[PDB]
Design a protein around this ligand. Structure first.
Ligand SMILES: *[C@@H]1O[C@H](CO)[C@@H](O)[C@H](O)[C@H]1NC(C)=O
Ligand SMILES: *[C@@H]1O[C@H](CO)[C@@H](O)[C@H](O)[C@H]1NC(C)=O
Ligand SMILES: *[C@@H]1O[C@H](CO)[C@@H](O)[C@H](O)[C@H]1NC(C)=O
Ligand SMILES: *[C@@H]1O[C@H](CO)[C@@H](O)[C@H](O)[C@H]1NC(C)=O
Lengths: 32, 222, 404, 125, 89, 81
């Protein structure tokens, strides 16, 4: 013994996931 | 009390005058942005921007209250953070308090005891006559008896040597017994070593003790 | 009797035109006893040394007055010409462990008794006798003592990125309007910021719900970081601090002069590297070191705990660090042939036992926004004027367009 | 040092030298006192957020629970009509999961609206 | 009556003439203080390890101070027994 | 629990007069030099609150949304007999 914050990239990944989910949901409206 | 510095906002200086002026500014800008009703709508919009969930109240003039809403929500979040940081966590203040002079003048009879045939009783005998006379009612047969009396609530305080009380408080089970803060010792002295007057051993014993203190050999034992 | 200059204990001031000092009362209402004390005007070398009589007072002189009253002493106050506590130092004649400063003056016979904050030391005790200490104190360090980045501590571009997110939804709402205008972006800006702003409605609701949850998650991440985390930047733990154990030019720390702290460091041969850097930052007296610490010349100044805590109480900008080490007590140093040792010890013990030391401590020792939100308040206040000015400009432009 | 010991120029040697088969055979050694060996040294909210390292490490039970609770809420909202299922119920649920929905609005709807209490409790947790 | 209670709960539970409205706005504003305090208390009680943070080591006060509430011992006369017998403190 | 204390090593108990001690030590050093001990350790030694409250709250709310509703329906039926 004697001698010897804020958001991150995964937040952007979650943003991408929710954007993809929103696009998938909106595809039904788009085709309709 | 309430809405004061002890309540929250440990600074309490800027906001207590900022809230009124920002409310007045909001009222003025909303009444200027008519192309409305001051009391009927400006105050309602001010309250609706201070906190998100509020009453359903309503060019770019009315659009530009988003900056004020952002400032208000940031202020609310900062207030919450300050309250969280301040909510994470001692009245004798020495022997000069009035309780030691008039223990019986309070609603609960204060009960302090000492150990006779010692240094504390000798000191208080020649310094506080009436206090010593009151103390004689609560004499204790030993340190352990006084400690268990204080722990069980029989005694409200126990006056004794500083080192022994500090040791007991530091190693107490449950940490329910504490001394009078730190540095509040009335007669700060030391134990030392007793020698016969005129003996030829003090002249080297004192030197050895001071060498041990200087060399740091005392810290590990303490 | 000779004494050394120490602001918490020995205040020394120039005398008035009559050779004395102003009669003043303390905060408690007690008289402030002061005496005429002989010493050099400037103890530093290379100065026009003049032995003008100054006026000195404080805790030490009060204790001296009490001792004189209890022992019928006719004290003659003197100031150390050397200006240092003094110890065994080699100046010339090769091997010469001769005491200098106050200790040397006492040994030379010029001084008969010493009353001063003289730390008890074994080497001093070899040739001098110390009475019972009137107080107990150790050694500590003195050092000058978070949410300024209100927007972002790092990666400030995020404010833009989330703003871009508004776009990636605003153009969306227009598209649903085309395959079913201008307020979509305004509503996206003002949905979280409350300001009163077939399947298309469902898609709008779900997309704005996702945007709102993303925004509140980002806000919680930003604000919850500003929490109970330590505001001070690596306060010195004490003698066991690894930074002190590893001397460097970036972080310098040293004592004042060859005082009792210097003797303790000399005895502790473990801190050999500490001595080398310590010898380069010595100061003439404690006041110069305190000023340097206040001026940030010294990162930390190691000195007696009582003096450091008194200065911290007087000057709140500097704070004390370290728990306790080299615990000792100030005492009166006298020559071995002095017969007053027992009398002085008994008088000091009696005074400390009867509460006189408490009175002395009370009279002398015992004494008494920013970019977190003001920055954003200033920003919004400045922006409000520009906003209302541009509102007036655009209203005038609309009126001109309507008139044409 | 080993060569110095070999040729009788050093009776005892202590220089933090390691112990291996080659050295042990050539020169004797005593019981070791400090652990050592061959090692590799390299350079030393940062971890993943919104995922298993942050919360819901198992990431299956909570993932299915957050969906089945919404399904049960939709089913009971449909059953409480004596409104409708699918789009209207999903929109109402996704509007009531947070307290910042503007386009969201006898007693059945009010009774279902108490799910905002569960939503805010979940947000606080 | 009864609808007024639901109307008030819609604001208190964030579920979505001027004489009553002026005090109602203050009540709605104060309603957020309750949930903020609840969140702060939950955070304070969740970030702190309520039980003991395990045994620090040999110098742990629990090991240095014997007590029947926290018993600790070796198995038998093994190497640990000799190691402890070597020390005297 | 506990970082480390009384660090030592497991040894091969042998008699002082046993002539195999040096050979055993050499064999152990040779085996540990090539990582045989590491392979043995890998093959033999080197092996492999929020949810509860969340589930309780979810169960409570899904029970309440039905119980309070049926109570209110009974109250409405009583008021509109
Ligand atoms: C203290 O001294 C008194 C005599 O003054 C004696 O009666 C008593 O037993 C003593 N108590 C203890 C604990 O020694
Ligand atoms: C000093 O002490 C001695 C013995 O304790 C006493 O006789 C003498 O009077 C004392 N000196 C003074 C000035 O009181
Ligand atoms: C104090 O002691 C001195 C002895 O040096 C004596 O002459 C003087 O009278 C004493 N003073 C009093 C008040 O007793
Ligand atoms: C130890 O190993 C050496 C290797 O050459 C061998 O000669 C010797 O016989 C071995 N010792 C015993 C006791 O077999």
């Amino acid at each position: 013994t004697l001698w010897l914050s804020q958001l991150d990239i995964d937040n952007m990944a979650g943003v991408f996931y929710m954007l993809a989910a929103a696009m998938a949901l909106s595809l039904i409206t788009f085709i309709w | 009390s309430a809405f004061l510095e002890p309540f929250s906002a440990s600074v309490w200086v800027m906001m207590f005058v900022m809230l009124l002026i920002v409310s007045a500014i909001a009222v003025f800008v909303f009444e200027y942005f008519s192309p409305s009703f001051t009391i009927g709508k400006a105050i309602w919009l001010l309250w609706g921007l201070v906190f998100n969930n509020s009453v359903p109240v309503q060019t770019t003039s009315k659009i530009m209250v988003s900056v004020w809403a952002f400032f208000a929500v940031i202020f609310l979040a900062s207030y919450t953070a300050n309250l969280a940081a301040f909510m994470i966590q001692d009245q004798v203040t020495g022997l000069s308090d009035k309780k030691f002079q008039r223990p019986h003048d309070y609603s609960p009879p204060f009960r302090f005891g000492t150990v006779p045939n010692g240094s504390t009783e000798r000191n208080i005998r020649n310094n506080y006559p009436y206090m010593h006379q009151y103390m004689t009612k609560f004499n204790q047969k030993g340190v352990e008896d006084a400690l268990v009396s204080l722990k069980t609530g029989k005694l409200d305080a126990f006056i004794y040597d500083a080192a022994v009380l500090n040791y007991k408080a530091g190693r107490d089970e449950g940490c329910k017994l504490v001394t009078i803060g730190s540095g509040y010792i009335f007669a700060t002295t030391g134990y030392g070593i007793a020698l016969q007057k005129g003996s030829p051993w003090k002249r080297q014993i004192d030197l050895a003790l001071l060498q041990f203190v200087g060399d740091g050999e005392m810290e590990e034992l303490e | 009797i000779v004494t050394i200059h120490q602001e918490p204990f020995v205040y020394v001031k120039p005398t008035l035109s009559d050779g004395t000092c102003k009669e003043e009362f303390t905060v408690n209402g007690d008289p402030v006893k002061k005496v005429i004390c002989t010493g050099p005007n400037d103890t530093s070398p290379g100065s026009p040394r003049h032995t003008v009589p100054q006026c000195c007072y404080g805790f030490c002189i009060d204790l001296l007055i009490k001792l004189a009253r209890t022992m019928n002493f006719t004290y003659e106050v003197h100031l150390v010409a050397d200006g240092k506590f003094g110890t065994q130092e080699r100046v010339n004649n090769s091997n010469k462990k001769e005491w200098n400063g106050m200790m040397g003056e006492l040994l030379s016979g010029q001084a008969d008794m010493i009353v001063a904050p003289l730390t008890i030391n074994n080497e001093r005790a070899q040739y001098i006798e110390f009475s019972k200490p009137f107080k107990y104190q150790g050694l500590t360090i003195l050092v000058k003592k978070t949410l300024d980045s209100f927007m972002q501590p790092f990666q400030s571009t995020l404010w833009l990125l989330v703003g871009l997110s508004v776009h990636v939804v605003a153009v969306m709402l227009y598209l649903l309007d085309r395959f079913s205008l201008s307020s979509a972006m305004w509503f996206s800006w003002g949905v979280l910021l409350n300001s009163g702003i077939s399947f298309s409605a469902r898609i709008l609701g779900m997309v704005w719900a996702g945007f709102a949850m993303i925004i509140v998650a980002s806000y919680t991440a930003n604000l919850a970081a500003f929490l109970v985390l330590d505001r001070p930047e690596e306060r010195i733990t004490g003698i066991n601090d690894p930074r002190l154990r590893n001397p460097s030019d970036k972080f310098i720390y040293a004592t004042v002069k060859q005082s009792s702290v210097d003797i303790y460091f000399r005895r502790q041969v473990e801190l050999s590297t500490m001595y080398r850097h310590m010898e380069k930052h010595n100061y003439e007296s404690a006041a110069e070191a305190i000023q340097a610490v206040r001026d940030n010349k010294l990162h930390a100044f190691i000195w007696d705990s009582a003096v450091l805590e008194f200065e911290a109480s007087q000057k709140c900008d500097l704070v004390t660090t370290g728990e306790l080490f080299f615990r000792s007590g100030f005492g009166i140093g006298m020559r071995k042939d002095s017969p007053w040792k027992q009398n002085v010890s008994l008088s000091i013990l009696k005074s400390h036992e009867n509460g006189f030391m408490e009175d002395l401590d009370k009279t002398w020792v015992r004494y008494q926004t920013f970019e977190n939100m003001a920055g954003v308040f200033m920003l919004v206040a400045g922006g409000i004027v520009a906003g209302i000015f541009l509102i007036f400009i655009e209203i005038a432009y609309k009126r001109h367009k309507d008139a044409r | 040092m080993i060569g110095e010991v070999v040729y009788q120029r050093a009776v005892m040697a202590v220089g933090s030298l390691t112990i291996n088969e080659e050295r042990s055979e050539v020169v004797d050694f005593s019981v070791p006192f400090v652990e050592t060996g061959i090692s590799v040294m390299v350079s030393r909210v940062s971890p993943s957020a919104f995922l298993e390292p942050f919360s819901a490490s198992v990431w299956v039970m909570m993932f299915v629970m957050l969906l089945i609770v919404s399904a049960i809420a939709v089913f009971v909202f449909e059953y409480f009509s004596p409104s409708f299922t699918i789009g209207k119920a999903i929109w109402l649920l996704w509007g009531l999961v947070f307290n910042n929905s503007v386009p969201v609005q006898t007693t059945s709807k009010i009774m279902v609206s108490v799910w905002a209490f569960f939503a805010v409790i979940f947000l606080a947790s």
